[PDB]
Amino acid sequence: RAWSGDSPYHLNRPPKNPRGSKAQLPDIHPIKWSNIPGLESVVINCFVREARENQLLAITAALQLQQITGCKPHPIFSKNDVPTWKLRKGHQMGAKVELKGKEMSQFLSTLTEIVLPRIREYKGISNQSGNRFGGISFGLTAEDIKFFPEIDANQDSWPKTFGMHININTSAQLDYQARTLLSGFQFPFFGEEK
Amino acid sequence: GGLLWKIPWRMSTHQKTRQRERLRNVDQVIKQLTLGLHVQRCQDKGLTYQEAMESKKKYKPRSKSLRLLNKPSVFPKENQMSSKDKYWTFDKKAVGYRKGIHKVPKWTKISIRKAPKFF
Amino acid sequence: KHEYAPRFKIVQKKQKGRVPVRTGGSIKGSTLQFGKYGLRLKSEGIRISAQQLKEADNAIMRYVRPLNNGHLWRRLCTNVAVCIKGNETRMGKGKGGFDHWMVRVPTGKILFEINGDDLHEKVAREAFRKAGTKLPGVYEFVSLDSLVRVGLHSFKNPKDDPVKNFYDENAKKPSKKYLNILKSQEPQYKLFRGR
Amino acid sequence: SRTSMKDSAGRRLGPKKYEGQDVSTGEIIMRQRGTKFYPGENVGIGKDHSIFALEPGVVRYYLDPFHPKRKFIGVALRRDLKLPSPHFEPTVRRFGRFELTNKRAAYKEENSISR
RNA sequence: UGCAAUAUGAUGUAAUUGGUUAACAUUUUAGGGUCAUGACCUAAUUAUAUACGUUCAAAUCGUAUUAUUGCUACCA
RNA sequence: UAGCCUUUAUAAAUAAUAAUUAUUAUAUAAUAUAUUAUAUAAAGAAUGGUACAGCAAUUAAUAUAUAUUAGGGAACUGUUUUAUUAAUAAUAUUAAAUCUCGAAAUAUUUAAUUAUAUAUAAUAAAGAGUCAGAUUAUGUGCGAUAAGGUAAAUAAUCUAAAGGGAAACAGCCCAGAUUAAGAUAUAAAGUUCCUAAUAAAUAAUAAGUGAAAUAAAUAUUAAAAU
RNA sequence: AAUAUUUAAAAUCAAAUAUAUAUAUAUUUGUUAAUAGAUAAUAUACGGAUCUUAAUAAUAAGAAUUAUUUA
RNA sequence: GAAAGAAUUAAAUUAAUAUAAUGGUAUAACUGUGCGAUAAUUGUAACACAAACGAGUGAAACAAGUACGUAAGUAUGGCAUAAUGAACAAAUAACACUGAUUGUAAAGGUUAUUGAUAACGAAUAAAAGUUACGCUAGGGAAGGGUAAUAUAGCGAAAGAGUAGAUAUUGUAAGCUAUGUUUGCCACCUUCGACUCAACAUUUCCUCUUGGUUGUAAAAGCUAAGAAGGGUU
Ligand SMILES: [Mg+2]
Ligand SMILES: [Mg+2]
Ligand SMILES: [Mg+2]
Ligand SMILES: [Mg+2]
Ligand SMILES: [Mg+2]
Ligand SMILES: [Mg+2]
Ligand SMILES: [Mg+2]
Ligand SMILES: [Mg+2]
Ligand SMILES: [Mg+2]
Ligand SMILES: [Mg+2]
Ligand SMILES: [Mg+2]
Ligand SMILES: [Mg+2]
Ligand SMILES: [Mg+2]
Ligand SMILES: [Mg+2]
Ligand SMILES: [Mg+2]
Ligand SMILES: [Mg+2]
Ligand SMILES: [Mg+2]
Ligand SMILES: [Mg+2]
Ligand SMILES: [Mg+2]
Ligand SMILES: [Mg+2]
Ligand SMILES: [Mg+2]
Ligand SMILES: [Mg+2]
Ligand SMILES: [Mg+2]
Ligand SMILES: [Mg+2]
Ligand SMILES: [Mg+2]
Ligand SMILES: [Mg+2]
Ligand SMILES: [Mg+2]
Ligand SMILES: [Mg+2]
Ligand SMILES: [Mg+2]
Ligand SMILES: [Mg+2]
Ligand SMILES: [Mg+2]
Ligand SMILES: [Mg+2]
Ligand SMILES: [Mg+2]
Incomplete structure (x- = not known):
């Protein structure tokens, strides 16, 4: 936010920080042919x-x-x-x-085809997750990684297995656009949106 | 403060007359300094002394010091000053933020014409 | 809550300094901004300790409390810390230990402010008068219609102060640095920077 | 009682050569901590960020449009020369070195080569 | 800067013209004990300091690495 | 030893001191949006960060039936809400030796010109004395915004300075004693008498307030303006 | 007239001055008094005397205080 | 209309800088990487800043060699300001400069390096106390100023006073007066008793007076005028 000019002390004053945040946020453009939410x-x-x-x-x-x-x-x-x-x-x-x-x-593809449809209590990815401007993240527990084809084939050589974090970055301007996009790649969602 | 410097806090009527005269003399010095410059410039243009004094146009000084000394806001003339400024000066460590002008060292010679607007 | 007890992380034995004499005619802190009535200094600038302000505040609160929606605003903070050695000591040996806090109040600064749905303008005047008897200066009573004091005998109404934009004024009389910055963007200088 | 009387004597910083002064080679035209004034033309800078003239001339303080928010000090080769020299004009150089007219001096110099 | 000597259990002590992790001793139990104490029997100790050559052969020799204490050269 | 003083001299010596021009803009005219001349205005070539001014960042302070997080009781009847409190966000208001986003005057300082030449600088050879300071005015550190206190900074005087004035007075206002005279101007200060010198104008005081060293908060009386 | 505020040239009004000049702009100046509070030691202490005016009435006095001025 | 590139603009020096604080740094002085390990070299160093001297700081330029870079060029340690110590006497090496009759030598000399005088311009390699039994030459190298404190008053009135702040009492803060106590500055180097007292009033008694639901009388409390007499 620029300094309103009403005092002789604004000539070289650095501009104020944004209203509610200490970091600038990007603009949100209407979706058109050029910009369609997609993975990156x-x-x-x-x-x-x-x-x-x-x-x-x-x-x-x-x-x-x-x-x-x-x-x-x-x-x-x-x-x-x-x-x-x-x-x-x-x-x-x-x-x-x-x-x-x-x-x-x-x-x-192999995550949704194989690993995801093998957790007993799986309900999907929380709707609350996701950076404000695109980006969705979830996490796989230690035992879920045993479901991958390359560990299931050689369980003998994989005595110890442990979880990880997943982050999907997309061209979606906002989160809700990304969630609709990822749903097309066979991703479920269960919670209530913001 | 045992030693007695019996300097009164007010001036006598005679000190005030002399102060007014001293201010007028300084103004007259300034008035004459400008006059010489105007006459000298007019002689440079070709005029003579007499017509220079009678010229309708008076060439104002161009030097910074003389230009400001001719501004009533910066250096007011005796007939323009207030009575307080003629006889009282501004001290920030005195009751009323004023003190007798005669208490300023060398007050007879030094010139203090302007005081802060609200003091 | 900490107006008379600032929370500086590191304690410093500040110098004595001098109470400012606002020669420039500034009105900052000399206008009502929170309440309906107030109190301000009339005499020359003075320093007021925490004890004096605490006790002046108690006098005012004696009248604010028996009121509906009664609020008292404190416009002064005891920022300066003053250290005093005991009388029974030789001069020297450094500076003494901290004793209390002070505040330098120029000639026409406002110290308190009161408001309430039923003030009657008489209890406010009485309260401020009593509170002034506990302070080391001479004070009077201000309202929204009172003129802003700028000196011992001079008053000013801030509404008449002009309002002007300075960005355009700077363009009228630009500085050397500003001209260089504007001149740097010129194509014959921006396209050959080498950066 | 214990008192802190340990304070370093002030360093004699500040401009040692003002605008218009005629300087010679190596003269110190400013001693400052950091680079408050950057070097300009016909002038150098040392370990202590001291600015010193490289050629005889007139010291001028100027601002270069190429480097906004940066004060400069330089040494114009002549009094009538404005230091922020036009960019696309031939640089004003000084030959300085003189010709050896004496026959013996010329003979010695011609027959003097690097190791 | 140069030199010399120590430094065994957790306890404080061994001892060596090499050919030993040796006991008193501290702690945990056991046994006789009306009940104890005091005896006798067990179980753990030692990097018997640091790390390497000669030695059937290394804590018993000195080096490399250490922790402590002393005597010397400089002493303007 | 340096700093401040003295004696004698050297020129290829004015290099010393002081001020002015420099810069920005407006108006008129001439020349090819620019240059020149003339007038005017602006605290007016280059360096700076004190006063002032401000709350920018840093360090602190205040208030919001404003919003969010968390804490806790009640209501609701475990939900959310409410009662709230701390923090943050937003708005508004403040200050500081070690804050300056704005910013003086004085100040540092530059080339040329002009004026001081019965005058300055610089340099060479030889001599000292001094290294206990004081007051006044201004801006400060310590003290308690105390001291005829103490420590520094700037200017003047006493030190080493006669004379006039402040009754008397080292330091305050003037003014610097070659010796005479005493005609004329006078500085500070004064003019009823002591005591050299005066007449007036417009208002206030009734207290001998005051009249050459102003004593405050407050109370009473009265006078103007709203 | 009664009541409640302030004692102010900032704003407003009046006047003066410099520029364009019958007007406008700009600058400058103009906003209470008395008393009580009131204070110690050789002796009243503005340096002392003393200083506030009065027609009938003198050749003739009427601040010698405070504020702004003149010759 | 789209993809990529060159990038530009705004913000940023709050992170980082071997180390305190300050100034500087994004054109980076900050970070990463290749080569490198070179300039963490060698003889003359003018001229300036600073400066009593001793010393200290920047550094143009000439000459020899090295590292990096295609080249232009950069490097004489660290972004800068602290990280220190004179002579004398000794010790080590190099130069070939003297060599006390000559030849050597001994010894000295020039060049480079070493060790702390921290009271840090370092009086010796080496030094603490007592004196009222004291001595010599010198200087002061109770009065006065201030009033934090103390005493007293004034303004306002929180609260006691059976009721009511102002009969009497009067928290804490405010404005003053005196210099009678404890202090502070250094212009200025004897407590008590006996005898005689003089002066002030901020009045203990005596004289006049105001207030006192707390003056019924008498005794009392508070206050005003009063220093004539008295005050073991
Ligand atoms: Mg201020
Ligand atoms: Mg310093
Ligand atoms: Mg000397
Ligand atoms: Mg000259
Ligand atoms: Mg300062
Ligand atoms: Mg600035
Ligand atoms: Mg001395
Ligand atoms: Mg003194
Ligand atoms: Mg003397
Ligand atoms: Mg005299
Ligand atoms: Mg003299
Ligand atoms: Mg004379
Ligand atoms: Mg009198
Ligand atoms: Mg007299
Ligand atoms: Mg006006
Ligand atoms: Mg008397
Ligand atoms: Mg560094
Ligand atoms: Mg920094
Ligand atoms: Mg110098
Ligand atoms: Mg020197
Ligand atoms: Mg580096
Ligand atoms: Mg010696
Ligand atoms: Mg030989
Ligand atoms: Mg021989
Ligand atoms: Mg030898
Ligand atoms: Mg000794
Ligand atoms: Mg004895
Ligand atoms: Mg005394
Ligand atoms: Mg009561
Ligand atoms: Mg009290
Ligand atoms: Mg009496
Ligand atoms: Mg009775
Ligand atoms: Mg009688």
């Missing part, structure tokens, strides 16, 4: 907290992300320091992979 990337976040003691377990995360997603996993190292959690800064604990294009499409 999918990011898998895996933070093995137990790696604080056994670092060797973090490697198993990279393998798990590799086998499932099929792309090279970029590792995740600590950044903060919480003594209450025995958390130390500068240690490897997990891996992440950026998925785009066809490989992301395969992941999304």
Whole structure:
């Protein structure tokens, strides 16, 4: 918000912060042919907290992300320091992979085809989830990852399995556009919207 | 404050007359300084001394100091000042925020014509 | 709640300083902005401690409390901290320990404000008069129709103060830096920056 | 009682050469902490961010439109020269070095080569 | 800066012309004990300091790594 | 030792001091939206961040039947709401030695010109004394916005300064003693007498207030304007 | 006349001045008094005397206080 | 109409900077990366800032060599301001400069480096107290100013006073007066008793008077005028 000119102190004053937020928010354009909500990337976040003691377990995360997603996993190292959690800064604990294009499409398909329709109490993705401007996230527990074809085939070589975070980025301007979009790719929703 | 500097807080009628005269003298010095510049410029244009004094147009000074000294707002003339400003000065550590002008060092020579608008 | 007890994280033994004499004729803090009646200083600038303001406040509240929707606004904060050594000490040995808080109130600053659905304009005048007897200056009574005081004997009505935009005024008399900034956007300078 | 009397003597900073002054090579035209004034033309800068002239001339304080929000100090090669020199004009250089007319001096210099 | 000596159980002590993780001892129990105490029997200890060559062969020799204490050179 | 003083001199010496022009804009005319001349206005070439002014960011303070989160009782009858409180958001109002988004005057300082030349700077050779300061005025640190207090900053005087004035008076207002005279101007200060010198105009005071060192909050009486 | 506020040249009004000049703009100046409160030690202490006016009536006095001025 | 690129504009120095605070930094001085390990080199250093001297700071330029970069060019340590110590006497090495009759040598000299005088311009390699038994040369290198404190008054009145703030009492804050107590500055280097007292009144008694649902009388409380006499 610009400074109204009524005093000789506004000439070089930096502008005020937005009304209710400390960060500027983007504009929302009407949907047209050029801009139609569509997918752009999918990011898998895996933070093995137990790696604080056994670092060797973090490697198993990279393998798990590799086998499932099929792309090279970029590792995740600590950044903060919480003594209450025995958390130390500068240690490897997990891996992440950026998925785009066809490989992301395969992941999304195999997630809804195989892994998702195998949880006993599954109801869908919460309608409350999602960044205000596009982007939807959910999470898979430790036991859900056993449902992937590449772990089910070699259960012997996968003694330990553990959950991860999923984030689907899309060209949707707002969340509700994304939810309608993702529903076309066989994604269920259960909660009540905002 | 044992030592006695018996300086009164008010002026006598005779000190006031002299103060008014001193202010007038300073104004007359300023009035004469401008007059010389006007006459000198007129002589430069070709005029003579007599017609320069009788010229309807009076060339105003161009120097910053003389231009401001001729502004009544900046340097008021004796007939334009208030009685308070003639005899009283502004001190921020005095009751009434004013003190006798005669208490200013070298008041006879120094010139203090302007005081803050509301003080 | 902390008007007379500021919560500075780090305590500092502030200098003595001097009570400002607003030579520029500023009216900031000298106008009613929260209530219907108020109290302000008439004499020269002075410093008021927390104890004096606390006790002046108690006098006013003695009349605000027996009222409906009665509010008292405190326009003054005891920002300055003053330290006083004991009398029985030689001069020197640094600065003494903190004792209380002060506030520098210029000639015409408003200290309190009152409002209520039934004030009658008489209890307000009595309350402020009594509260003034506990403070170290001379004060009077202000209302929405009262003129704003700017000096010991001079008054001013803020409505007559002109209103002007300064962005356009700057363009009328631009500064050297502003001209350079405007001149930098020119194509013969923006297209050859090399950045 | 314990009192803090430890205070460093002030550093004699500030402009040591004002606008219009005629300077020589290496003269310090400003000692400042940080770069409050950036170097301009025919002038250098040192470890202490001290600005010093590189060629004889006249010191001028100016603002370059290429670098808004940046004051400058330079050394115009001549009094009648405005320092923010036009961008697309040949730079004003100074040869400075003189010709060796003496025969012996010329002979020595011609027969003087790098190792 | 140079030099020398220690440093065994958790307890404080062994001891060595190498060829031993040895006992008193501390704690947990057991047994006789009307009941105890006091005896006798067990169970854990020693990184008998740090880490490597010669030695059937290394805590018994010195190096590399250490923790403590002392005597020396500089001392403007 | 430097700083402040003195003696003698050197020119390829004015380099010293002081001020003006510089800059922006308006109006008129000439020249090819620009240049020149003339007049006028503007705190007027370059550097700065004090007063003032302000609440920008930082540090603090106040209020909202405003909104959200969480806490708790009641109502509803476990729900939501209400009673609220702390925090944040929004609006409005404030201040500060170590805040300056705005910003003076003084100040630092530059080239040319002009004026001071019975005048300044610089330089060379030789001599000192001083290194306990005081008051007044202004802006401050300490003290208690106390001290004929203490510590610094700027200017003047005393120190080392006669004379006039403040009754008397080192430091305040004038004014600087070569020796005479005493005609004329006078500075500060005064003119009923002591005591050198006066007559007036318009209002107020009735208290000897006051008349050459103003004592406050408040109360009473009266006078103007709304 | 009674009652309640302030004692103000900021705003308004009046007047003066500089520019375009019968007008307008700009600048400058103009807004209460007395008393009580009232205070210690050799002796009243404006330096002292003393200073407020009065027609009948003098050649002739009528602040020597405060505020703004003149010659 | 669409996709990609070059990017531009606004905001930002609040993060980060080896280390305190301040100034600077996005054109980054901050971060990542390749080469590198080079300039964390060598002899002359004019000229300036600062400055009593000793010292300290920036650095153009000439010459030898090195690293990076296609090149232009950059590098004489760290974004800048702290991270320090004189001589004397000793110690180590290099130069080839003297070599006390000559030749060597010894010893000194030039160049480079070493060790702390922290009272940090460092009086020695090496030094604490007592004196009322004291001594010499010097300087002051109760009065006065102030009134925090103390005493007293004034303004307003919270609250007691059977009722009612103002018969009497009067929290805490405010405005003053005195210099009678405890202090502060340094212009100025004897408590008590006996005898005699003089002066002030902020009056203890005596004289006149106002108030006192708290003046029935008498005793009393408070206050005004009053310093003539008296006050173990
Ligand atoms: Mg202020
Ligand atoms: Mg400093
Ligand atoms: Mg000397
Ligand atoms: Mg000259
Ligand atoms: Mg300051
Ligand atoms: Mg600024
Ligand atoms: Mg001295
Ligand atoms: Mg003194
Ligand atoms: Mg002397
Ligand atoms: Mg004299
Ligand atoms: Mg003199
Ligand atoms: Mg003379
Ligand atoms: Mg009198
Ligand atoms: Mg007299
Ligand atoms: Mg006016
Ligand atoms: Mg007397
Ligand atoms: Mg750094
Ligand atoms: Mg910083
Ligand atoms: Mg210098
Ligand atoms: Mg030197
Ligand atoms: Mg660097
Ligand atoms: Mg020695
Ligand atoms: Mg030889
Ligand atoms: Mg020999
Ligand atoms: Mg030798
Ligand atoms: Mg000693
Ligand atoms: Mg004795
Ligand atoms: Mg005394
Ligand atoms: Mg009561
Ligand atoms: Mg009290
Ligand atoms: Mg009496
Ligand atoms: Mg009776
Ligand atoms: Mg008698």
